[PDB]
Each structure stands twice: as C-alpha cells, then as structure tokens.
Design an enzyme around this catalytic site. Structure first.
Site, PDB file in Angstrom:
ATOM      1  CG  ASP A 150       0.350  15.927  12.325  1.00  0.00           C
ATOM      2  OD1 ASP A 150       0.783  17.087  11.666  1.00  0.00           O
ATOM      3  OD2 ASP A 150       1.848  14.955  11.504  1.00  0.00           O
ATOM      4  CB  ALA A 183       9.649   7.523   8.567  1.00  0.00           C
ATOM      5  CG  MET A 222       6.237  -2.418   4.501  1.00  0.00           C
ATOM      6  SD  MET A 222       6.292  -3.022   3.081  1.00  0.00           S
ATOM      7  CE  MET A 222       7.775  -2.169   1.899  1.00  0.00           C
ATOM      8  CB  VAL A 223       0.811   0.577   4.864  1.00  0.00           C
ATOM      9  CG1 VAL A 223      -0.613   0.426   5.515  1.00  0.00           C
ATOM     10  CG2 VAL A 223       1.425   1.232   6.349  1.00  0.00           C
ATOM     11  CB  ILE A 283      -1.083  -0.527   1.461  1.00  0.00           C
ATOM     12  CG1 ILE A 283      -2.446  -0.966   0.779  1.00  0.00           C
ATOM     13  CG2 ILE A 283      -1.525   1.706   1.187  1.00  0.00           C
ATOM     14  CD1 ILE A 283      -3.206  -1.076   2.361  1.00  0.00           C
ATOM     15  N   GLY A 284       1.818   1.531   0.681  1.00  0.00           N
ATOM     16  CA  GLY A 284       2.478   2.852   1.361  1.00  0.00           C
ATOM     17  C   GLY A 284       3.817   2.513   1.819  1.00  0.00           C
TER      18      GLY A 284
HETATM   19  N1  LIG Z   1       2.357   4.805   6.394  1.00  0.00           N
HETATM   20  N2  LIG Z   1       2.181   5.235   4.940  1.00  0.00           N
HETATM   21  N3  LIG Z   1       2.192   4.727   3.669  1.00  0.00           N
HETATM   22  C1  LIG Z   1       0.665   5.693   3.532  1.00  0.00           C
HETATM   23  C2  LIG Z   1      -0.902   5.034   2.644  1.00  0.00           C
HETATM   24  O1  LIG Z   1      -1.152   3.661   3.735  1.00  0.00           O
HETATM   25  C3  LIG Z   1      -2.210   3.935   3.861  1.00  0.00           C
HETATM   26  N4  LIG Z   1      -2.510   3.305   5.404  1.00  0.00           N
HETATM   27  C4  LIG Z   1      -2.526   3.936   6.048  1.00  0.00           C
HETATM   28  S1  LIG Z   1      -1.690   4.735   6.933  1.00  0.00           S
HETATM   29  C5  LIG Z   1      -2.627   6.741   7.132  1.00  0.00           C
HETATM   30  C6  LIG Z   1      -1.331   7.694   7.768  1.00  0.00           C
HETATM   31  C7  LIG Z   1      -0.740   8.355   7.421  1.00  0.00           C
HETATM   32  O2  LIG Z   1       0.726   7.714   6.806  1.00  0.00           O
HETATM   33  N5  LIG Z   1      -0.513   9.129   7.285  1.00  0.00           N
HETATM   34  C8  LIG Z   1       0.958  10.435   6.989  1.00  0.00           C
HETATM   35  C9  LIG Z   1       0.816  11.072   7.459  1.00  0.00           C
HETATM   36  N6  LIG Z   1       0.673  10.528   9.191  1.00  0.00           N
HETATM   37  N7  LIG Z   1      -3.904   3.794   7.091  1.00  0.00           N
HETATM   38  C10 LIG Z   1      -4.650   3.227   6.003  1.00  0.00           C
HETATM   39  C11 LIG Z   1      -5.991   2.027   6.464  1.00  0.00           C
HETATM   40  N8  LIG Z   1      -5.986   1.749   7.957  1.00  0.00           N
HETATM   41  N9  LIG Z   1      -6.069   1.798   5.661  1.00  0.00           N
HETATM   42  C12 LIG Z   1      -5.764   1.636   4.488  1.00  0.00           C
HETATM   43  N10 LIG Z   1      -4.255   2.677   3.785  1.00  0.00           N
HETATM   44  C13 LIG Z   1      -3.909   2.735   4.760  1.00  0.00           C
HETATM   45  C14 LIG Z   1      -2.446   5.948   3.003  1.00  0.00           C
HETATM   46  O3  LIG Z   1      -3.621   5.971   3.069  1.00  0.00           O
HETATM   47  C15 LIG Z   1      -1.667   5.449   1.894  1.00  0.00           C
HETATM   48  O4  LIG Z   1      -2.562   4.756   1.329  1.00  0.00           O
END
Ligand SMILES: N=[N+]=NC[C@H]1O[C@@H](n2c(SCCC(=O)NCCN)nc3c(N)ncnc32)[C@H](O)[C@@H]1O
Length: 340
Positions: free
Chosen positions: A139, A25, A28-29, A21-22
């Site tokens: 934030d 720091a 990874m997600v 997904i992403g």
């Molecule tokens: N880390 N990282 N990569 C970001 C990617 O990871 C996705 N992501 C998250 S992290 C959202 C919080 C975050 O990082 N904010 C940036 C400032 N602090 N939580 C998800 C969830 N519960 N379901 C689906 N995607 C999810 C996010 O939308 C993006 O696609």
C-alpha cells in the site's frame, strides 16, 4: 486519564501535553511529550478488538515493525496498553514524531529535483530492506511516507503487507483488491493477487510521477477505470506482453480496446530530469516480469549521487489470515508484552 477531542487518550504518566493530529478508521493520532526521553513523539490509538480484519491489520503492523530496524522505516518506540487482556480495550503505538507526510507536502509544495531524487532514494532504500525480508508493503502511496523537519523519510503503515508468494500470484480477471486504487499495478485488474515484489515497484513509480508534477499520474475513479488511465499513458500492450497473460478474459479485454499510443514521459513532464524519466519508465513498465527491481532501481544513474549498496542494508532474515478475533487479541497482547 486525560482526554483529547472527545475520547480517552490514556497514555500516562510517561507521555503528557497531548495535541490532536488526525484520525483514520478506529483511532486517532496525537503528539505528546515523552517525559523520559524529553522529546515530543507521535502516539496512535488503535481500537481493533471487535473485528477480525482490524485485529489482522494491527497484528501484521506490530509484528512487522517490531522486527524491522531501518532508518527509512518507521519504528515502534513503545506500546502502551492495559496490564491484562480483560482490561485491554485499546493499544497505543508510540513512534517518532514526523512533521509531515508526502501527501500533505505534495498538496502545497513544489519539490526541487534534488528533493525528488533524495526522497526517491530513501523510498527505495527502505523498500530494499522490506523486500529483502521477503515482505511486500502492498500500500505504498504518499500518505504512507512520513517526513521529519530535515526531510528524513520513513515508510509506514504495514497493515496490508504480506509475505511474498509469487507461485500463487495468479487469479482471474477483475478480482477484487484492497490496496489504494491510484497506486495499483495494471496486473491487479488483469490476473494478479499482488503477491510479488513488482507490485511495490509500480506504486513507487506512481509516487515518482506524482513528485514530478504534484498530481497523481493515474487517478482512476473506480476499479476498471484505473486500468484505462494506465493504458491511456503507457499505450496498448505489445503482443509479447499480451502473450504473458494466459487468462483469456483478461487478454480478450485488452484486445477489445482500440489502439492507444504511448504518451512520451517528457511530454507529460517537460521540466523533469531526463534520468528521472528513464527510471520512471522502468518502474512503470506494463509487464511485471520486465519491471525494474528495487536493487536495480537504486543503481540507476538518476540515483548516482546517493547509491552505495554497502550503506543500503538488508534484513538479517526473511519473514495467517483466518483466525478468530479472539486469538488475535491474545496475539496482540503477547506481541506487545515486551513494553510492560
Ligand atoms: N491516522 N491518521 N491520521 C493521519 C494524521 O496522522 C499523522 N501521522 C501518522 S499516521 C500516517 C499513516 C496514515 O495514516 N496513512 C494514511 C493511509 N494509510 N504518523 C505520524 C507520525 N509518526 N508523526 C506525526 N504524524 C503522524 C499523519 O501524517 C496525519 O497527520
């Protein structure tokens, strides 16, 4: 143990069929199939143990999210880690899978006024709960607002959150600050440590403005530039608002500036609902003591179709920063034990 896009994503056997997904720091997600609940979930890998700061934010997030329970705040469904501290190098946080976030949505989608109203209602409803716990998110920004396919909105990322401390909010001029620049209240640059609830309302005002136009309202390029964007729209502070700033360096900086007129919100946002702009003005008020509070914002005429204080729940009870990363790993291990 199955791998994703380079490194180990060791979540099995309950969670399978992983998709990248992403990244952030230090982790990874991915999305993944929850073989017990038979739904795809989000899983975030966190590797914080070498740094006090990372351990601090991870502990803060886990502690707060495990205690909070609210429809507009992301929950922690599960936490995966090794059975022993020695073997624990990563922690995986399992959350509801959310289709998108407000940052991604604003990059490509125009929002109807009905969507803006609904999103703002949900942000403030979740914020009412956070503030009722005596917690500041600190934030808030579009990328920390997750959305599912039916546009349910959930606030996430509490790694910078703090317990409110209004009696110790004062500081000098140009004090360094951590939270995202474009969403910082003007007082952060003048005389505030961001220890009062009004810091979060400012950020929500910035988010509302960005929903109205798909562009950040105050996109400063560096610390003090942020203040000049704010003042370029709000205009010069009044004498009364300057008098609330006792610190002479901050007050004299403002007095040094040429007069600036306020830009009317309806010139900036000519298609916006007039009630939305009235609420925006109240959230983006320069003087933090005059800024609207969360419960007043929920009662504002713009939100009348949704407002219902009996359906806007509060926390059952309210909620340090100088601990070696060692005690912090132990604290994270302890905090996550309930999921073994
Ligand atoms: N880390 N990282 N990569 C970001 C990617 O990871 C996705 N992501 C998250 S992290 C959202 C919080 C975050 O990082 N904010 C940036 C400032 N602090 N939580 C998800 C969830 N519960 N379901 C689906 N995607 C999810 C996010 O939308 C993006 O696609």
């Amino acid at each position: 143990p199955e791998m994703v896009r380079g490194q180990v994503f060791d979540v099995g056997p309950r969670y399978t069929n992983l998709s990248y997904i992403g990244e952030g720091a230090y982790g990874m997600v991915c999305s993944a199939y929850d073989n017990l609940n038979k739904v795809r979930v989000a899983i975030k890998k966190i590797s914080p143990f070498e740094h006090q700061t990372y351990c601090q934010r991870t502990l803060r997030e886990i502690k707060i999210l495990l205690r909070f329970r609210h429809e507009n705040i992301i929950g922690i469904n599960d936490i995966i880690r090794a059975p022993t501290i020695e073997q624990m190098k990563d922690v995986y946080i399992v959350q509801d899978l959310m289709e998108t976030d407000l940052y991604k949505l604003l990059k490509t989608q125009h929002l109807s006024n009905d969507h803006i109203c609904y999103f703002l209602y949900q942000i403030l409803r979740g914020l009412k709960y956070i503030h009722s716990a005596n917690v500041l998110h600190r934030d808030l920004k579009p990328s920390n607002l997750l959305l599912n396919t039916t546009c349910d909105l959930k606030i996430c990322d509490f790694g910078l959150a703090r317990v409110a401390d209004p009696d110790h909010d004062h500081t000098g001029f140009l004090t360094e600050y951590v939270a995202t620049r474009w969403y910082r209240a003007p007082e952060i640059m003048l005389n505030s440590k961001g220890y009062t609830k009004s810091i979060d309302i400012w950020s929500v005002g910035c988010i509302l403005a960005e929903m109205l136009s798909n562009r950040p309202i105050f996109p400063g390029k560096h610390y003090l530039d942020q203040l000049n964007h704010i003042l370029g729209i709000l205009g010069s502070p009044s004498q009364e608002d300057l008098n609330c700033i006792i610190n002479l360096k901050a007050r004299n900086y403002l007095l040094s500036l040429p007069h600036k007129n306020k830009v009317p919100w309806n010139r900036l946002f000519p298609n916006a609902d007039s009630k939305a702009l009235d609420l925006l003005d109240k959230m983006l008020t320069f003087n933090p003591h005059k800024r609207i509070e969360v419960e007043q914002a929920l009662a504002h005429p713009y939100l009348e179709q949704y407002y219902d204080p009996s359906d806007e729940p509060i926390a059952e009870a309210p909620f340090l920063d100088d601990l070696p990363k060692e005690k912090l790993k132990e604290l994270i291990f302890e905090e996550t034990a309930r999921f073994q």
